[PDB]
Each structure stands twice: as C-alpha cells, then as structure tokens.
RNA sequence: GGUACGGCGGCCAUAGCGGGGGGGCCACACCCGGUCUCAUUUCGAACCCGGAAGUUAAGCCCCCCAGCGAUCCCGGUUGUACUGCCCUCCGAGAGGGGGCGGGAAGCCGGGGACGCCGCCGGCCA
RNA sequence: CUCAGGCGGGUCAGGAAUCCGCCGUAGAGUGCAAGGGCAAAAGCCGGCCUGACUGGACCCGUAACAGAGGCGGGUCCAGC
C-alpha cells in the first residue's frame, strides 16, 4: 500500500529525544546569531514546534542568505535545484 | 507504653533549643458522606465550634454503591494553626480521656484519632441542627526549619537527622500534655 | 538519581534560583535587564547584559551603600528602602550611559505595591525609563513611609511592649520610627544633590 | 503436520511479537526442569547444535519425554537434573490453502531458533550415572533436525569430555 | 589583595542520590507580629507587609566517602561478533572461506569521579 | 499548583467515600488511532478575552531527485 509523504512520516526515531535530554534546551542555541554567507547544519529540536523545517532535510548543511523576522533563510541544494527554507536558530548549528 | 530513650532525648531537647518541634496544624474532617442538609448542619456546627469557614471537599470519581457522584460536595474539613490551635487541641484532647494509643503514632511522630460525638464544651444545642456529629482529628508536628521544603524560592529537602520519628513524637506529646496507653 | 533514564534538571533549576522559561522571554528582547532581588534584610539591584560565556553586569547597587556611603538608619528590607535603592541604581545607570532596560523580578510573584515595583518606581523617577504601567507601583504615602510611622504611633498608644519588640533596633540605632518621612526626604535630597 | 525441513532454517525474520501476531497458538511444551534442580552434581552433560537451526516444540517435547523416562528408569528422580535451556518463541505460519492470492500465512505452531554452538539441554549427574547421561543426550540428539554433539563439564565449567570419556 | 559572603549566569549527573565532621566579621537563613500592601476555593500553611528577642538544629558555606546512579582511561574476552570491495576458493544445501580495508556491545580486573569555568558586588584591607 | 501508583495513621468507613504524613523522572494527563513532545508545563484550578479577524508578500509538502491544477503548512509587513 503506497503511502504519501507527510511532515512526521517515518520520524519516530529521527525526531525522538534522549531520555536524559528531556525538557527545553539551553538558551544559547535559542539566542545564537549567524551572518550572511555562513554555513550551518540543520539539527531539528523536537521540543520546539515553530520554525521547524521538514525532517526530510534534517542533517544537511546549508548557506545563510538572509534573515526575516526571527527565522534565518537557508539556501540548500536538493539534487540539482535550489530550495529556500526559513529556520529558527534553535534548529541550526554553526559549522566549525 | 514505655519509651526507653526518654532521658537522653530529654538531654537532647534541652541541649538544642531549635530541636524542639511544635504543632503546625490540627486538621478536623467531617465525613458526612452525602450532599444534603446534614452537610450544612455539619458546616454550621464546625463554624460555631472552631470559628473559621468550612471547605466543600468534592468527591473524586463516581460510585453508585455509596450513593455518590463525582464532583459532589461530600465532606468538609478545617485546618487550625497557632495558639488558637493549641487551645482547641487542648479542649478536644480533654473531651475524651487524656489517653492516646501508643500505636496510633506515624513513622514521623504524627498522631491522630477520631471522636464519634461532640463532648468538648459541646453545648446541648444539637436538636436544632445536629446529627452528623463525628470528627477525624489529626495533628502534625514539625521542627522549626521545615519551611525550607515549602518555600517556592530555593526549595530544598530536609535531611533524615532533622525530621521527627514516632518515639520523639510520642515523648513530645507526653511532655506537653496527655498520656499514652498500651492499646491492649 | 535512579537509573540511566533519570533526567537531572539544570544546576540553577535544581537550586531553585532561575526560571529558564522566563529567562528566554526576557532575553528575546535583547535589551539590558534590571535584575531586582530581595532578602530578609537587604535589596539588590543590578543591570545585566547577555553574553554566551556568561552574562555580564555593568552597574550594580546594594542597600549597604545607603547605610554607609550616603547614610541610612532604617531597615533595608522595606518598600521605602527599595524605592531609595531604585533611585540610586537609576542614577548610577544614567551616569554609566545606558538609557533603557527591562525589569527582571526573577521568580518573585508580581503582586502590586511590593518592593520590586518600588525599585521600579525609584528607577523611573531617577530617569532610566523602563516599560511599565503606573497602577502597579505602591502608594505614594507607602513609599514616603507613612505606614511604618502610623504603626509605630498605634503601638505606642497601645501597650508599649509591642512597640519595643517591633522596633527594638531603631531606638538603639538612634532613629525614632516617627519622622521617618523627614528622614526619607533628607536622604532623597542628598541623593539628588549628589547625582544632579 | 508438515515436514520439519520447512522450518529447519532461519532465513526468515524473527516472528515473536504476540501483541501483533493474531491467533498465535499456545505452547505444547510446559515442563522444562525435571529431577532434583537443587542437587549437587559433579558433572554436567550439555548438548550443542553444530549450526543455526530451528527446533519445533514437537521435537522438544518428544526429546523431553524420551530423556525423562530413560533417566527416571535408569537413575532415579533425585539422582539427576534435566533441563531444557531454550523456550520456543518463533511462530510458524502456513499459507491458507484461492492460490497464492493474499498468501500471508496464519499461525500453525511455534519453535525455538538457536545459533551455532548453542546449548539445547543439560543433564547434571554424578560420576555413577555419567553413561546414562550420555545415552540420554544421544537419544535426545536423535530427535533433532540438525547435527549435534555433547560435552561434559565440571563445576567450574571447563570441558573435560575427552579425559572423562577415556577414563 | 584576603573572605567556611552574596547576586547574575555557562557546560547541564565525571556535576546526581545517600552519609560523616566543622561555621556564623559582613552576609544568607530559620525565627517574632499581621494596623497597613497582599491572599487563603478554610487556614499569615504558601504569597505579601512590619523586624531583630533567640538559634547555628535545618537551608547555606568549607573538608571528607565509592553504598546506589552516571561517566572517562588502561588490560583480557579480541581483532571476538559484525561488515565494504574482488574471487574459476570450499560446500548437496543452509552457509562458509582467501586477499586488501574497518571494527563493536556486554562482561571481568585496576584506576578516575562527591563538579569545572565567566561577570560583578558585600565585609575586611 | 503538580500527576499515577504505593507505604504508615485515622468515627461511622468495609478492597473502594473524605482526611493527615512519607516515597514517587512521570510508571498520570494532554478530546479521539499510533508515533513524537511536554514537570516552577503543553498537565490540574482560576481571572480577562474572541488573533477561529482584515489587506498582502515570500517559501516548503502532497509531487525527493524532477514537471502541477486543487489543497495543507511555515516565515513575515501593515490595520484593528
């Protein structure tokens, strides 16, 4: 039986959280900032349901191309085409 | 009964003034069991006996066997603290003979009993509104610094050394007022 | 702890000092926060800014400054003392240069007419503007200290032992509970003269 | 019942979750310990399989009955301890026959899935009845669908098969 | 610059839980009383207001431990289990094997671990 | 403000009515399947309210890569 893709389709372990990590995260990730042209990983935080990108892109590295409101604009390369995402910084991580 | 540690624990109470506990609250419950005019009668009874307002304790879950429905006001209760609580406890404990079962004490030196008919400065004014007379009375003790676990800010847990025990509670009751029995 | 699935809260939450849910909302603004805290005998007012390594406090004021540097002879845990400390911290912040801040009463309840809001009124009067609504401040007479003087007069009219127990430290320090409003006006005058 | 060669091998995924397997049958073997489990017996004869296998509950029960009767007859209730170390968890299903249409099978039995060099059963006994223990192990091995061997261990647990048999 | 002082924080158990000893310059507490501010679906219990008669018994602060929990290093099991690429290598089959490249989990033994950092003030100086 | 469940105590009251202590990492609840997330809360109890609104922009998913009418969702500007 074919099943169409939904937001939380086959994310039982991907969006799960460690038992010792329960609760809200530390505020550093919430309050972090990035600059245009920076490269950032996408690590979704399950406990924060706003500004969440599609779990399809969880674990990918993108480029910051601006910031509207509180969310950052991340440009990513899916296959060969370009996709723009709006992600809250809590879901993002700097690339060292 | 007989407490073997009375002497050295007396040395302890006298040596450490802050180790002396006190009755923080006496709770009196009237389990009326039904939401009728008897409930109001018990409410007014405890109002004129204690002097403060009652509380309508509702029923959790529904049980047809006892003729109760969830959320129905069934029983009432009142909490007494301070010197007025001391006086009320004295008169209530005098109501019945000044004897307490030695086994009724909890693990943390908390004791309580029940009275199946008003007898404490009772007043024969029961025909107008009475009939549900009967009261579960439990007393709680505490060494002074137990508000650490009650205050919201910087709440902490008291160690095992600083909390009461059954023997200390019964000896405190004996020393202050009243006597124990061997309950058989 | 019980096992591997036991979640130990943050250190500050375990100690019951910081409300992280409110911390996040306060820090979202990005402006400096005027942190106000109170003890059994003293008040603390500070101006703090965020720093991921650890938040940095720029201007801080303690109520011992009132007793030593400027001269105070009253209990440092009352609404008038809170107002004086708020005025002092506002003047200090304006001297520092910062012009705006947001109040931070920690995990104290927001009950109107309290010491924290007395500090807020003192700061806004000093000049450091903080968003607020005037209805939360304590009464002007309360800030001037009329309540303590009234209680002292009532106690003196009543049995004097109650008055002695209540204010056994003021008399030895050398201050009568009466004329406290005059003492407050004197301290206010010296503060304004020094800072203006 | 179908031939045991159908279920002999372990190529299929494990099928154990009774919360989701509907109509799964109940065990036909309910006794796993016989004799004197508290007794102190010097030697322990264990039967090992030489390859991954699945042993049906029917084979387990047949071996249990044969070995228990033999040991009871030739040793005595209190002079041995016979144990079956493996419980049947795998569920064996068969196609309900339509033909090959909607062919998912329905539960028909259950079996125990065993890995290489794993122990199936153990007989603890003293030096007097070691030959009886060995014969019982051989009789049990005669009832299983794979190749099996037997080993003799002391109370420490080190193999002494060759030395004990030679002596 | 000293301090068995506090406030705001970072990593968020190698930091926790549970125990033993010691302390109160200042400071933090317990503690005393509810006229006023504030509140009890009753209760000054909590929250709030007014203080210092008393106590370091508790919180708090300093030093110690390996009982539970967590987690770091070393040795054994062990290059074991598992696995990527090639194969005219062995097997009736299942499945194994050679060369090159990776490499556990759990358990056993010995150490570690009763937190480490940032900013600013109080008291002394 | 903190739950389920449990231990000890208490007149009627019993396994189960209402109450007093201790333990309690969620073993409760969150309208409804399952999964994920939630402890000074997203749960329980209350106060006020109707942003379940108007005019628009851009972006992701159904439909990876790789085309789409209709639809769902996300990030925002302005008005009230």
- Packing angle between helix D130-141 and helix D57-74, nearest 10 degrees? 160
Token couple for B93: 């404990």
Closest CA to B114 of B142, B129, B133: B133
Point out the residue among C4, C10, C52 whose CB comes nearest to the CB of A28. C52
Q: How far is the CA of B165 from the C1' of F10 (A)?
A: 18
Chains C and D touch (3+ CB pairs under 8 A): no
- Nearest nt to C177, CA vs C1'? E50
> Can you tell me the distance from the alpha carbon of C128 to that of C195, in angstroms, rounded to the nearest whole number?
13
Cβ within 8 Å, pair B155-C16: yes
Strand F closer than 7 Å to the CB of A62?
no
* C24 in A contact zone (CB under 8 Å): yes
Can you spell out the DSSP letters for D125-148? E-GGGHHHHHHHHHHHHTTSSS-E
β-bridge pairing B179-181 and B99-101: parallel
CA angle in degrees (0–180, nearest 5) for B39-B45-B48 = 140
Q: How far is the CA of B147 from the C1' of E54 (A)?
A: 18
CA-based nearest residue in chain B for residue C16: B154
Q: Which residues contact B101 (CB under 8 A, 6 or more apart)?
A: B113, B180, B181, B183
What is the number of residues in chain B?
A: 184
Can you spell out the DSSP letters for B28-82? EEE---SSSHHHHHHHHHHHHHHSS---EEEPSS-BTTTTB-TT-EEEEEEEE-S
Coil/strand/helix, residue D85: coil
User: At residue D48, what are phi and psi to the nearest 5 degrees?
Assistant: -115, 145
**Under a CB-based contact definition with an 8 Å cutoff, are residues A23 and A57 in contact?**
no
Neighbours of D158 (CB within 10 A): 7
Which position has the token pair 């010097």? D42
A-C C-beta contacts closer than 8 Å: 28
Q: Which residues contact D154 (CB under 8 A, 6 or more apart)?
A: D42, D43, D44, D160
> Can you tell me the distance from the alpha carbon of C71 to that of C80, in angstroms, rounded to the nearest whole number?
14
* C9 in B contact zone (CB under 8 Å): no
**Strand F positions closer than 7 A to protein CB:** 1, 8-23, 25-26, 35-42, 58-67, 73-77
User: At residue A64, what are phi and psi to the nearest 5 degrees?
Assistant: -80, 125
**Under a CB-based contact definition with an 8 Å cutoff, are residues D96 and D27 in contact?**
no
Taking the CA of residue C131 as centre, how many other CA atoms within 13 Å lie in the half-sphere pointing to its CB? 7
Q: Which residues pair with B141 in a beta bridge?
A: B23
> Which residues in chain B precede a discontinuity of more than 2.5 Å between C and N?
none
> Can you tell me the distance from the alpha carbon of C138 to that of C39, in angstroms, rounded to the nearest whole number?
19
> Can you tell me the distance from the alpha carbon of C21 to that of C25, in angstroms, rounded to the nearest whole number?
7
Neighbours of C191 (CB within 10 A): 18
- Nearest nt to A88, CA vs C1'? F75
* A93 in C contact zone (CB under 8 Å): no
What is the number of residues in chain D?
A: 167
| Chain A residues with beta carbon closer than 8 angstroms to that of C10 | 26
Q: Which residues contact D65 (CB under 8 A, 6 or more apart)?
A: none
Q: How many helices (H) and strands (E) does chain D have?
A: 3, 8
Cβ within 8 Å, pair C5-A27: no
Q: Which residues contact C41 (CB under 8 A, 6 or more apart)?
A: C75, C76, C77
Token couple for C185: 């006006």
> Can you tell me the distance from the alpha carbon of D29 to that of D112, in angstroms, rounded to the nearest whole number?
12
Distances, alpha carbon B36 to alpha carbons B127, C58, C98, C148, D80, in Å: 17, 65, 66, 49, 73
**Under a CB-based contact definition with an 8 Å cutoff, are residues B79 and B166 in contact?**
no
**Under a CB-based contact definition with an 8 Å cutoff, are residues A66 and A36 in contact?**
yes
User: At residue D100, what are phi and psi to the nearest 5 degrees?
Assistant: 60, 10
Cβ within 8 Å, pair C23-A27: yes
Closest CA to B58 of B42, B41, B39: B39
Which position has the token pair 């000044």? B98
> Which residue blocks in C41-78 are alpha helix, DSSP H?
64-65
- Packing angle between helix C146-157 and helix C180-195, nearest 10 degrees? 160
Cβ within 8 Å, pair A20-C6: yes
Strand E closer than 7 Å to the CB of C17?
yes
β-bridge pairing B73-80 and B56-58: antiparallel
> Can you tell me the distance from the alpha carbon of C2 to that of B183, in angstroms, rounded to the nearest whole number?
40
> Can you tell me the distance from the alpha carbon of B43 to that of D9, in angstroms, rounded to the nearest whole number?
77
Neighbours of B140 (CB within 10 A): 22
The region that residue D131 occupies, defined by phi over 0 for left and psi between -120 and 50 for alpha, beta otherwise, is alpha
The enclosing H or E element of D121 equals strand D119-125
Q: How far is the CA of B5 from the C1' of E41 (A)?
A: 45
Token couple for B21: 């506990």
> Can you tell me the distance from the alpha carbon of C45 to that of C25, in angstroms, rounded to the nearest whole number?
20
**Strand E positions closer than 7 A to protein CB:** 6-13, 15-20, 26-32, 35-38, 41-55, 57-60, 68-71, 93-95, 115-123
Q: Which residues contact A36 (CB under 8 A, 6 or more apart)?
A: A64, A65, A66
Q: Which residues pair with D68 in a beta bridge?
A: none
Coil/strand/helix, residue D56: strand
β-bridge pairing B22-30 and B135-142: antiparallel
Cβ within 8 Å, pair B152-C15: no
> Can you tell me the distance from the alpha carbon of D110 to that of C56, in angstroms, rounded to the nearest whole number?
68
Token couple for D65: 């009955």
Cβ within 8 Å, pair B154-C107: no
CA dihedral defined by B137, B142, B148, B149, rounded to 10 degrees?
A: -40
**Under a CB-based contact definition with an 8 Å cutoff, are residues B178 and B99 in contact?**
yes
Token couple for D98: 């339509």
**Under a CB-based contact definition with an 8 Å cutoff, are residues A24 and A80 in contact?**
no
Point out the residue among A20, A24, A31 whose CB comes nearest to the CB of C27. A31
User: At residue C169, what are phi and psi to the nearest 5 degrees?
Assistant: -100, -30
> Which residue blocks in D75-117 are alpha helix, DSSP H?
none
Distances, alpha carbon D105 to alpha carbons B130, D92, D94, D145, in Å: 74, 9, 4, 23
User: At residue D24, what are phi and psi to the nearest 5 degrees?
Assistant: -65, 135
What is the C-alpha end-to-end distance of chain C, expressed in Å?
Answer: 57
Distances, alpha carbon D127 to alpha carbons D44, D75, D84, D134, D160, in Å: 10, 12, 21, 11, 13
> Can you tell me the distance from the alpha carbon of B28 to that of B52, in angstroms, rounded to the nearest whole number?
12
Chains C and B touch (3+ CB pairs under 8 A): yes
Q: Which residues pair with C35 in a beta bridge?
A: C46, C104
Buried b (16+ CB within 10 A) or exposed e, C59-82: bebbbebbbeeeebebbbebbbbb
Token couple for C155: 């106690």
Coil/strand/helix, residue C123: helix
Neighbours of chain A (3+ CB pairs under 8 A): C
Q: Which residues contact C145 (CB under 8 A, 6 or more apart)?
A: C78, C79, C80, C180, C181, C184
CA dihedral defined by B32, B33, B35, B38, rounded to 10 degrees?
A: -30
What single-letter DSSP state applies at residue A12? Answer: T
CA-based nearest residue in chain A for residue C50: A31
- Packing angle between helix B166-176 and helix B6-15, nearest 10 degrees? 80
| Chain C residues with beta carbon closer than 8 angstroms to that of B155 | 16
Which position has the token pair 């943390």? B108
CA-based nearest residue in chain C for residue B156: C15
Closest CA to C87 of C34, C116, C125: C125
CA dihedral defined by B137, B143, B144, B148, rounded to 10 degrees?
A: -90
> Can you tell me the distance from the alpha carbon of B144 to that of B19, in angstroms, rounded to the nearest whole number?
7
**Under a CB-based contact definition with an 8 Å cutoff, are residues B6 and B172 in contact?**
no
Point out the residue among A27, A31, A32 whose CB comes nearest to the CB of C20. A27
Which position has the token pair 């026959």? D97
User: At residue D142, what are phi and psi to the nearest 5 degrees?
Assistant: -65, -15
* C11 in A contact zone (CB under 8 Å): no
Distances, alpha carbon B20 to alpha carbons B9, B106, B124, B169, in Å: 11, 18, 39, 11
The dihedral through the CA atoms of B24, B30, B36, B38 has a sign that is: negative
The region that residue A23 occupies, defined by phi over 0 for left and psi between -120 and 50 for alpha, beta otherwise, is left
> Can you tell me the distance from the alpha carbon of C101 to that of B25, in angstroms, rounded to the nearest whole number?
45
Cβ within 8 Å, pair C15-B154: yes
| Chain C residues with beta carbon closer than 8 angstroms to that of A32 | 52
Coil/strand/helix, residue D4: coil
């Amino acid at each position: 039986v074919q099943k169409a893709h939904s937001f939380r389709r086959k994310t039982r372990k991907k969006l799960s959280k460690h038992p010792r990590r329960r609760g809200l995260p530390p505020l550093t990730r919430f309050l972090q900032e990035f600059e245009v042209g920076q490269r950032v990983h996408i690590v979704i935080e399950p406990s924060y349901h706003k500004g969440m990108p599609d779990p399809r892109f969880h674990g990918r590295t993108g480029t910051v191309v601006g910031k509207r409101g509180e969310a950052y604009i991340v440009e990513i390369k899916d296959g060969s085409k370009v996709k723009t995402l709006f992600i809250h910084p809590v879901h993002l991580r700097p690339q060292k | 009964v007989e407490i073997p540690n009375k002497e050295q624990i007396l040395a302890d109470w006298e040596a450490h003034p802050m180790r002396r506990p006190r009755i923080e609250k006496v709770t009196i419950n009237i389990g009326v069991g039904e939401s009728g005019e008897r409930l109001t009668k018990a409410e007014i009874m405890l109002q004129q006996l204690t002097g403060q307002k009652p509380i309508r304790r509702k029923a959790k879950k529904t049980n047809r066997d006892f003729g109760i429905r969830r959320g129905e006001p069934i029983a009432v209760k009142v909490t007494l603290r301070g010197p007025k609580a001391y006086e009320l406890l004295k008169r209530l404990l005098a109501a019945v003979d000044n004897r307490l079962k030695a086994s009724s004490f909890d693990e943390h030196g908390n004791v309580c009993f029940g009275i199946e008919e008003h007898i404490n400065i009772p007043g024969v004014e029961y025909d107008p509104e009475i009939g549900i007379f009967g009261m579960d009375v439990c007393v709680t003790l505490e060494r002074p610094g137990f508000r650490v676990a009650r205050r919201k800010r910087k709440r902490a847990k008291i160690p095992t050394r600083h909390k009461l025990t059954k023997e200390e509670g019964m000896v405190y009751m004996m020393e202050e007022f009243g006597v124990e029995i061997v309950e058989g | 702890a019980h096992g591997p699935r036991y979640r130990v809260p943050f250190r500050r939450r375990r100690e019951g000092k910081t409300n992280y849910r409110k911390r996040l909302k306060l820090l979202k603004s990005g402006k400096p926060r005027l942190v106000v805290r109170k003890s059994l005998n003293h008040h603390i007012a500070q101006i703090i800014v965020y720093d991921p390594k650890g938040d940095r406090t720029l201007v801080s004021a303690h109520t011992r400054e009132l007793i030593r540097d400027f001269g105070w002879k009253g209990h440092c845990g009352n609404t008038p003392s809170a107002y004086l400390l708020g005025l002092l911290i506002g003047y200090k912040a304006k001297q520092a240069g910062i012009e705006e801040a947001i109040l931070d009463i920690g995990l104290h309840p927001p009950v109107r007419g309290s010491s924290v809001f007395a500090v807020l009124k003192g700061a806004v009067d000093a000049g450091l503007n903080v968003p607020h609504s005037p209805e939360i401040f304590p009464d002007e007479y309360r800030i001037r200290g009329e309540h303590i003087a009234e209680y002292a007069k009532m106690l003196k009219e009543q049995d004097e032992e109650k008055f002695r127990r209540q204010f056994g430290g003021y008399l030895v320090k050398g201050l009568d509970p009466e004329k406290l409003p005059e003492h407050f006006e004197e301290v206010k005058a010296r503060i304004i003269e020094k800072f203006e | 019942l179908r031939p045991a060669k159908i279920d002999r091998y372990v190529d299929k995924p494990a099928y154990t979750r009774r919360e989701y397997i509907r109509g799964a049958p109940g065990p036909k073997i309910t006794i796993f310990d016989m004799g004197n489990p508290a007794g102190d017996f010097e030697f322990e004869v264990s039967l090992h399989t030489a390859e991954p296998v699945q042993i049906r509950q029917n084979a387990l029960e047949a071996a249990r009955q044969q070995v228990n009767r033999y040991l009871q007859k030739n040793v005595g209730r209190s002079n041995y301890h016979f144990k079956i170390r493996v419980y049947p968890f795998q569920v064996l299903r068969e196609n309900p026959m339509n033909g090959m249409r909607r062919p998912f099978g329905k539960p028909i039995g259950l079996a125990a899935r065993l890995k290489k060099d794993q122990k199936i059963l153990s007989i603890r006994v003293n030096r007097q009845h070691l030959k009886f223990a060995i014969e019982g192990a051989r009789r049990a091995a005669m009832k299983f669908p794979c190749k099996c061997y037997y080993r003799i261990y002391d109370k420490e647990g080190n193999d002494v098969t060759t030395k004990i048999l030679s002596q």
